[PDB]
Amino acid sequence: FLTNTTYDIVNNDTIDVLKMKLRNQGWPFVERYNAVEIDMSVEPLRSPGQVGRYYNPFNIDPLTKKHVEDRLEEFINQVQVGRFRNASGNAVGTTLAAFLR
Amino acid sequence: ANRATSAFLDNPHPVGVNYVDEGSRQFVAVAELLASKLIDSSRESDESNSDVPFVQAYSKFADDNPRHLRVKTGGKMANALTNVIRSYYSINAPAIVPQVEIDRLASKATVSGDMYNSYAIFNSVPIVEVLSPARTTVSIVGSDRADVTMLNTGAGAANITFNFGQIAETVILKGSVPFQLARLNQPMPAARFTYKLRPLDGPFIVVLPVGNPLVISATAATRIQVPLAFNKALVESGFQTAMNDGLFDIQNVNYYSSFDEFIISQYHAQDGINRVSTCVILGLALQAYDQMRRALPVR
Amino acid sequence: ANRATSAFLDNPHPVGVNYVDEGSRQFVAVAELLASKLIDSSRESDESNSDVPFVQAYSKFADDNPRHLRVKTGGKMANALTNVIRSYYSINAPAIVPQVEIDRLASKATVSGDMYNSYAIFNSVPIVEVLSPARTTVSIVGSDRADVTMLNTGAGAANITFNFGQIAETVILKGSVPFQLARLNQPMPAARFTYKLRPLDGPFIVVLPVGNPLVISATAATRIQVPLAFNKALVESGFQTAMNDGLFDIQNVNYYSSFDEFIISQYHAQDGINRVSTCVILGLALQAYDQMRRALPV
Amino acid sequence: ANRATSAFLDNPHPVGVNYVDEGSRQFVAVAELLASKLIDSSRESDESNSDVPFVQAYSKFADDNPRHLRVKTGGKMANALTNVIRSYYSINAPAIVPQVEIDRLASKATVSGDMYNSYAIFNSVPIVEVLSPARTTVSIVGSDRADVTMLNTGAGAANITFNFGQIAETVILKGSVPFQLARLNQPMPAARFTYKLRPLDGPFIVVLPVGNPLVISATAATRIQVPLAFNKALVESGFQTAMNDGLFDIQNVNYYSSFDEFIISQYHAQDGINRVSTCVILGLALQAYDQMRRALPV
Amino acid sequence: ANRATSAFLDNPHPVGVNYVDEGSRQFVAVAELLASKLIDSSRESDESNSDVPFVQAYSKFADDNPRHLRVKTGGKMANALTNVIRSYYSINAPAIVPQVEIDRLASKATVSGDMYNSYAIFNSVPIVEVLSPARTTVSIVGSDRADVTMLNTGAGAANITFNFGQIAETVILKGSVPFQLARLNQPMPAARFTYKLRPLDGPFIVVLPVGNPLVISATAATRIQVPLAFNKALVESGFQTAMNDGLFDIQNVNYYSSFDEFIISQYHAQDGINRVSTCVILGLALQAYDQMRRALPV
Amino acid sequence: MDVLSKGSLKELLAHLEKTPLEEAISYRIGTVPYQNVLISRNEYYNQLYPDTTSLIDGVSREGQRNVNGLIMSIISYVVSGSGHYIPNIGFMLLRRSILDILTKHDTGLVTNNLNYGIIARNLTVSKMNCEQRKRMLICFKLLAYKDGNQNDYEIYLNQNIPLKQIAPNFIPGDMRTVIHNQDQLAIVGIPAYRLTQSTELSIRDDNAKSYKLGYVDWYNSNSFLRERSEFNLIRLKDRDTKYGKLNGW
């Protein structure tokens, strides 16, 4: 969508090659973010207790009370001012940025 | 001439050359962080009269839920930490921990493997050599405080040469009676009780008069780069624990009374700059070991 | 007659007479409090993945936001704290930081300047003098644990006088072999391995029999009023760092193996009470120096 | 007869044969490009009053975000760059960087991997041999400018044979007093101060009159193919930094004052044409090492 | 015996003690940044026909608009930089620049003003002492490269002691002929052309056989902490300009051929740790002086 | 881990075709192979537990620089998951696949002098389990076919009765034999029994259980490839095919 290519052209490209193509065009969201494990305990009551762990939803760290990526605000501003399909698209960066916020 | 040297400086055995990369350094830091949570949870269990905080922390440390009738030892994490500690001490100790196990355990908690963030002060006194004339006797005892007893039986005053090495930063010399000390080819000063010395200044000459023996007490301080989580009290307690459990019982190795003696002895050997890096990781590992065993005891 | 004395008690140098007012005491108290948070913010930052706790702690301490590609010295607080430690040690050291700068840095936190609320135990042994007869040899080694080796080559037994001063609260005497000790003009008791004495009781007489030498090991405990934040482990580490960093290097000063030797020596000087008051403020500043320098090594 | 030779031309140790493929050559060039960006990121940070330029530069170089309280060492790229420098110097130095790690780092940026795009001029003067008769003494001092001192103690004038090798392009000879120099069979010209010679022309004969000693100063220029980004100022700084850091501390190797001496000595050794190719990659690796370590001193 | 020493290490004069605070160091850093923009503005004014880049650069530097018929002198900043440079060289030079002027000029740009970000390598060789027997002659020439000429007229081989100080990190010795070198009281190895030594190892003994003279060429590398903007080429050029412009003519000051040997000579004096801090600030001031004077001559 | 998971001859040879030699070689110093050592097993005993280190442990060891060490490093990678420390082999050899080294003359490595009995003894064939011995015998057959030493391979099997019974049946030049083969060569896999997070006494058993527990985590990790759910997202070149043939077979 953003680099003006087709699936067949980029079929054999690796992840690092794909990351370079998007980053040069101005797209920063090219990384997976690990979730934060939240430790959980069930009080015993009649039965013996259980201890478990689960991922905090939406990749939000409870300690920082924010998303794991510390450059998210800078990344969204980068998309807002970016130009992606100048010849065949209009306001792609602004529309995508508004959705991200 | 007669030569006397400190006992703990003699023949430092080579340290291990394994588990010193970034991945292994992360595993040791992770183990230390998780061991601290284990000891705090056990305190919380005592105050809350509930085993939930301790079971909660033991599961993260050992990847297993504690079950009755089975002894709590720390799981696979304890097995890796104990065997890695042995490898750090001596090069003759085997390396038996796979790389897959180190990588898995290092991913349990997020932490840096940096071992040069901060510094610590070590008080072992390096006396590399004391050279004395024929008619004099010199005896050196002690490591934290070194007492050098000198007796002169000759007709005239004798000169004793003191070599404190090049690694220690400052050395403070206190005498039972006032005495004269000066550097090589320097006029002797008036008799004084105390001397503050820089070991890099060179060999030091002490005038030993004929008569009652003169005893010189030496204290030294040196700076070694350590991680911020380093705690000297915890490291020393772990060193004695590792000795009692017999993890340091390896062939052709030298035994030290304290971790302060061990790190200074390795520093003064050849290629000591490379040895001291391995010793720092061992100290952090011993801190994790000390906290792990105190949380999970065996009679 | 021969006289033997402890080495660390000899010739205590005069201490500084500046930065002992209420505003200056507040500055040291503020520095210790803000430096402690600096060392704790480093641990909390490592536990999480954010440098925010350290940035807040450093910004308060250094009055400047931390930046990469900079040494992170510590700002004006680090400079002011370093200079006051120099002034405390000796009266010869100049007083550089102005009183206006001290007051401005003291307003960063609201803490009391009281330095004598709590107490601490110091274990240096003050053997002021040991008087021995003609045919006896006496040697004193050590400060934390003082070992006195005495040998009698005379025909008969000799009496040796021990003077421990008047500041120490208790002194425990342990011998290699059981020995007899009693106060002046008092009967000697049966031989005992250990003695507990109050130095204020008076000079003590030890019977030295003819034969193998007798070694007496002395341990003492003196209580000194200090702030509640006082920590002996942190103070001693800062003392070594202070000497290693070369801010105690002034003409005509005496050097010591530890802060404990420094404070007991000043207590036994002429104006002991006044000297100790300044040294306690130096101890708290050294405690702040240790915590600040371990977080920000330059 | 006596033989005199330059000190730096004696026994060039073998150089490494690893990390010389196209994939590893891209890694060195990529490391140089990214290490440069760290240096310029410092200036851009001052202009913008923000650390954003440095964060982008360091994140690309190290693959982790910069964090306070963590010593910035450069990440995996710095470790790989240090080890390949070790392997280039000596053939016995182990190669411990996996190829998959080299390929991953080389993909961080796109660069021209050609190490023969450009050339550089090297100033070390090769004096392979100076042949002198029995009654004359010859001494050679210097590498950038070689001063050859010859003294004639015999009765008659002597002929001294100079051999400048075959690699050097031009050699300029200057004398304290005018002297005569010619080829092997060419007639002697009138005495003059300076001579310009082609080393491939042949051995050169210099007449040495009896009397005061004659000193000849030699200057040479050599052309070696190098990548276009090559900078002699940065390579020399990196060479000194690597020697001090102990990167070259390995048994059975030679040591040189400058990278100029090292590359010329290997050129004149057996199999010199394929040795200088490895030394050029070492120079670009040392250029990256200098820039990276100055930005991130450890 | 006989003793020889390097000429440039003899009698280093005291340096100034003014303008060494944090604010003054910020002024030196600001001047370097703004002076660099003046030189860069000329090239930008060539790519684009406009003179806007130079007018902007000069207006920030001199606080006035450049005029066609008026000489461009640099304004108040040029006068402050020249007078501040004089103060660093000697303690007898007056300090006449008001602090309120220094603080005002330091606010023109936001720079770290920090002096210990990075390092640099200095090539002066500190031959502190060469001790020779009675029947030998030793001569030392050169500072960047030192050639020591030794001749033995005695009956047997002579031992010569070399002392390189404790500051330098590495010293490389190359001889005209192979020679023997070892530490004090150590067995002597086989003769070889080059030696790599650590000056802290100790005094070095050289065997001098009877016969033809032996010349040892010495090169040393020393690491000194400097700002990240430090550039050795600009500092050396600025050092020569200041000497020609008369900034360094004060009574009872030593003179040096290069800034390299000036900083090394001060480093080998007593309290050399403190002297180098002042000298580094002088280097950045000289770097600013060179760029400003080349852009605005006279 | 990935090499230990392969359970059929077709998968094992396919993995070796795509795996370079540098994966077999390890760049960690390790320790000397044959030593009587005392290790710590606190779950079972208070005293130190004697054991002997070996080359088929899961931890890297120091290896001889000769060709014998290179082949012995390849087999240890196949049967134990880790290789040995043989540095400075060279770019040309390290970039080749493991199958190319074992089967092709164009690599430039000469291995016709190798003795299968000495290699087996140095690898401690007595300590190997059934799957480990089958995997090593596959390596021997590929080497024998490369060097034209088929007769020597058969005689070595005749001397060792247990090895003959478990010897895999495939011709190293024909792909039809590999497809038909049904021998189970998996060392790690999904366990039918109860697998617990408990230590083992010996070095080999403890290191093997680490791979077994790691494989379970790898199986549920995002790195694992689930053919049933994501077959279309796989690239066509490396997609599973019924008519899959090794080059030259």
Short mmCIF file of N, CA, C and O in Angstrom, two decimals, chain B residues 137-191:
data_model
loop_
_atom_site.label_atom_id
_atom_site.label_comp_id
_atom_site.label_asym_id
_atom_site.label_seq_id
_atom_site.Cartn_x
_atom_site.Cartn_y
_atom_site.Cartn_z
N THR B 137 64.72 -10.00 60.87
CA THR B 137 63.60 -10.93 60.70
C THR B 137 62.33 -10.14 60.41
O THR B 137 62.05 -9.14 61.08
N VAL B 138 61.57 -10.59 59.42
CA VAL B 138 60.34 -9.93 59.00
C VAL B 138 59.23 -10.97 58.93
O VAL B 138 59.41 -12.04 58.33
N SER B 139 58.08 -10.67 59.53
CA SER B 139 56.91 -11.54 59.50
C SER B 139 55.69 -10.72 59.12
O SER B 139 55.48 -9.62 59.65
N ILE B 140 54.88 -11.26 58.21
CA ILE B 140 53.67 -10.60 57.73
C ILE B 140 52.47 -11.47 58.05
O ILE B 140 52.44 -12.65 57.68
N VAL B 141 51.49 -10.90 58.75
CA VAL B 141 50.24 -11.59 59.07
C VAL B 141 49.07 -10.68 58.71
O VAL B 141 49.18 -9.45 58.75
N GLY B 142 47.96 -11.29 58.35
CA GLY B 142 46.73 -10.55 58.12
C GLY B 142 46.55 -10.13 56.67
O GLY B 142 47.51 -9.96 55.92
N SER B 143 45.29 -9.97 56.28
CA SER B 143 44.93 -9.51 54.94
C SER B 143 44.20 -8.18 54.95
O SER B 143 44.60 -7.25 54.24
N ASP B 144 43.12 -8.06 55.73
CA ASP B 144 42.43 -6.78 55.84
C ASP B 144 43.31 -5.75 56.53
O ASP B 144 43.38 -4.59 56.08
N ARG B 145 43.98 -6.13 57.61
CA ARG B 145 45.01 -5.31 58.24
C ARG B 145 46.26 -6.16 58.36
O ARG B 145 46.24 -7.21 59.01
N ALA B 146 47.34 -5.71 57.74
CA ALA B 146 48.59 -6.46 57.69
C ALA B 146 49.56 -5.89 58.71
O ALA B 146 49.92 -4.71 58.64
N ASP B 147 50.00 -6.73 59.64
CA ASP B 147 50.99 -6.35 60.64
C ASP B 147 52.33 -6.95 60.25
O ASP B 147 52.46 -8.17 60.15
N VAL B 148 53.32 -6.09 60.03
CA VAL B 148 54.67 -6.51 59.66
C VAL B 148 55.56 -6.29 60.87
O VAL B 148 55.80 -5.15 61.28
N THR B 149 56.06 -7.39 61.44
CA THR B 149 56.92 -7.34 62.62
C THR B 149 58.37 -7.48 62.17
O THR B 149 58.73 -8.46 61.51
N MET B 150 59.19 -6.50 62.53
CA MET B 150 60.59 -6.46 62.12
C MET B 150 61.48 -6.35 63.35
O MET B 150 61.24 -5.51 64.22
N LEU B 151 62.50 -7.21 63.42
CA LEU B 151 63.47 -7.19 64.50
C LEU B 151 64.86 -7.13 63.89
O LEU B 151 65.17 -7.88 62.97
N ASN B 152 65.70 -6.23 64.41
CA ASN B 152 67.07 -6.06 63.94
C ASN B 152 68.03 -6.53 65.03
O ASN B 152 67.99 -6.03 66.15
N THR B 153 68.88 -7.49 64.68
CA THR B 153 69.89 -8.01 65.60
C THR B 153 71.30 -7.60 65.22
O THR B 153 72.25 -7.97 65.92
N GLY B 154 71.47 -6.84 64.14
CA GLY B 154 72.78 -6.43 63.69
C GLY B 154 73.35 -5.29 64.52
O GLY B 154 72.75 -4.81 65.48
N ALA B 155 74.55 -4.86 64.12
CA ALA B 155 75.22 -3.80 64.85
C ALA B 155 74.59 -2.44 64.57
O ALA B 155 74.43 -1.63 65.49
N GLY B 156 74.24 -2.17 63.31
CA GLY B 156 73.71 -0.89 62.91
C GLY B 156 72.30 -0.98 62.35
O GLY B 156 71.72 -2.06 62.24
N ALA B 157 71.78 0.19 61.99
CA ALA B 157 70.44 0.27 61.43
C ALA B 157 70.39 -0.37 60.05
O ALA B 157 71.34 -0.28 59.27
N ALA B 158 69.28 -1.02 59.75
CA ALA B 158 69.07 -1.70 58.48
C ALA B 158 67.94 -1.04 57.70
O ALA B 158 67.10 -0.34 58.26
N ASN B 159 67.94 -1.27 56.39
CA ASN B 159 66.93 -0.74 55.49
C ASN B 159 66.08 -1.88 54.95
O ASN B 159 66.62 -2.85 54.41
N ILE B 160 64.77 -1.76 55.10
CA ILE B 160 63.81 -2.75 54.61
C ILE B 160 63.03 -2.13 53.47
O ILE B 160 62.50 -1.02 53.60
N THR B 161 62.95 -2.84 52.35
CA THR B 161 62.26 -2.36 51.16
C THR B 161 60.85 -2.93 51.12
O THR B 161 60.66 -4.15 51.25
N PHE B 162 59.86 -2.06 50.95
CA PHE B 162 58.46 -2.43 50.90
C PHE B 162 57.92 -2.23 49.50
O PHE B 162 58.07 -1.15 48.92
N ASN B 163 57.29 -3.26 48.95
CA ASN B 163 56.67 -3.21 47.63
C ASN B 163 55.19 -3.51 47.78
O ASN B 163 54.81 -4.62 48.17
N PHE B 164 54.35 -2.51 47.49
CA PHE B 164 52.91 -2.64 47.64
C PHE B 164 52.20 -2.84 46.31
O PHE B 164 50.96 -2.81 46.27
N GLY B 165 52.93 -3.04 45.23
CA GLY B 165 52.32 -3.26 43.93
C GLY B 165 51.94 -1.97 43.24
O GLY B 165 52.33 -0.86 43.63
N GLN B 166 51.17 -2.12 42.17
CA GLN B 166 50.74 -1.00 41.34
C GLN B 166 49.23 -0.86 41.25
O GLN B 166 48.76 0.09 40.61
N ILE B 167 48.47 -1.76 41.86
CA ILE B 167 47.02 -1.77 41.69
C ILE B 167 46.32 -0.96 42.78
O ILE B 167 45.40 -0.20 42.49
N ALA B 168 46.74 -1.11 44.03
CA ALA B 168 46.09 -0.42 45.13
C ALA B 168 46.21 1.09 44.97
O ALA B 168 47.20 1.60 44.44
N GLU B 169 45.18 1.81 45.41
CA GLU B 169 45.12 3.25 45.25
C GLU B 169 45.87 3.98 46.36
O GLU B 169 46.79 4.76 46.09
N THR B 170 45.49 3.74 47.61
CA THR B 170 46.16 4.33 48.76
C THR B 170 46.49 3.26 49.79
O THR B 170 45.75 2.28 49.95
N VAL B 171 47.61 3.46 50.48
CA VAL B 171 48.03 2.60 51.58
C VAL B 171 48.37 3.49 52.77
O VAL B 171 49.17 4.42 52.64
N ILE B 172 47.77 3.20 53.91
CA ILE B 172 48.01 3.93 55.15
C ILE B 172 48.83 3.04 56.07
O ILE B 172 48.42 1.92 56.39
N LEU B 173 49.99 3.54 56.49
CA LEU B 173 50.91 2.79 57.34
C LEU B 173 50.92 3.42 58.73
O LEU B 173 51.20 4.61 58.87
N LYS B 174 50.62 2.62 59.74
CA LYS B 174 50.68 3.04 61.13
C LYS B 174 51.66 2.14 61.87
O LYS B 174 51.63 0.92 61.71
N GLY B 175 52.51 2.75 62.68
CA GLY B 175 53.56 2.03 63.39
C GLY B 175 53.32 2.02 64.89
O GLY B 175 52.70 2.93 65.44
N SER B 176 53.81 0.96 65.55
CA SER B 176 53.73 0.90 67.00
C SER B 176 54.55 2.01 67.64
O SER B 176 54.15 2.58 68.66
N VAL B 177 55.69 2.34 67.05
CA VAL B 177 56.51 3.47 67.48
C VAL B 177 56.82 4.31 66.25
O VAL B 177 56.74 3.82 65.11
N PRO B 178 57.16 5.58 66.43
CA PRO B 178 57.52 6.42 65.28
C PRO B 178 58.69 5.83 64.51
O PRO B 178 59.64 5.30 65.09
N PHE B 179 58.60 5.92 63.19
CA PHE B 179 59.60 5.33 62.31
C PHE B 179 59.76 6.21 61.08
O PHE B 179 58.91 7.06 60.78
N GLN B 180 60.85 5.99 60.36
CA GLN B 180 61.19 6.77 59.18
C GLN B 180 60.97 5.94 57.92
O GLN B 180 61.45 4.80 57.84
N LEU B 181 60.26 6.51 56.95
CA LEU B 181 60.02 5.86 55.68
C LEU B 181 60.13 6.90 54.57
O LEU B 181 59.64 8.02 54.71
N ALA B 182 60.79 6.52 53.48
CA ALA B 182 60.95 7.40 52.34
C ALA B 182 61.06 6.56 51.08
O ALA B 182 61.29 5.35 51.13
N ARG B 183 60.89 7.21 49.93
CA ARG B 183 61.01 6.53 48.66
C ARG B 183 62.48 6.27 48.34
O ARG B 183 63.39 6.65 49.08
N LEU B 184 62.71 5.60 47.21
CA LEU B 184 64.07 5.30 46.78
C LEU B 184 64.83 6.58 46.45
O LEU B 184 64.29 7.49 45.81
N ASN B 185 66.08 6.64 46.90
CA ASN B 185 66.97 7.77 46.64
C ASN B 185 66.36 9.09 47.11
O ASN B 185 66.46 10.12 46.44
N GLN B 186 65.73 9.07 48.28
CA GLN B 186 65.15 10.26 48.87
C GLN B 186 65.62 10.40 50.31
O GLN B 186 65.73 9.40 51.03
N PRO B 187 65.93 11.62 50.75
CA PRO B 187 66.37 11.80 52.14
C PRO B 187 65.29 11.37 53.12
O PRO B 187 64.09 11.58 52.89
N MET B 188 65.72 10.78 54.23
CA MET B 188 64.77 10.26 55.20
C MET B 188 64.14 11.40 55.99
O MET B 188 64.83 12.35 56.38
N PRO B 189 62.84 11.34 56.25
CA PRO B 189 62.20 12.38 57.06
C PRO B 189 62.31 12.11 58.55
O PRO B 189 62.94 11.14 58.97
N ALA B 190 61.71 12.98 59.36
CA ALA B 190 61.67 12.76 60.79
C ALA B 190 60.74 11.60 61.13
O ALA B 190 59.85 11.24 60.36
N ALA B 191 60.98 11.00 62.29
CA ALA B 191 60.17 9.86 62.72
C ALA B 191 58.72 10.27 62.89
O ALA B 191 58.42 11.29 63.51
#
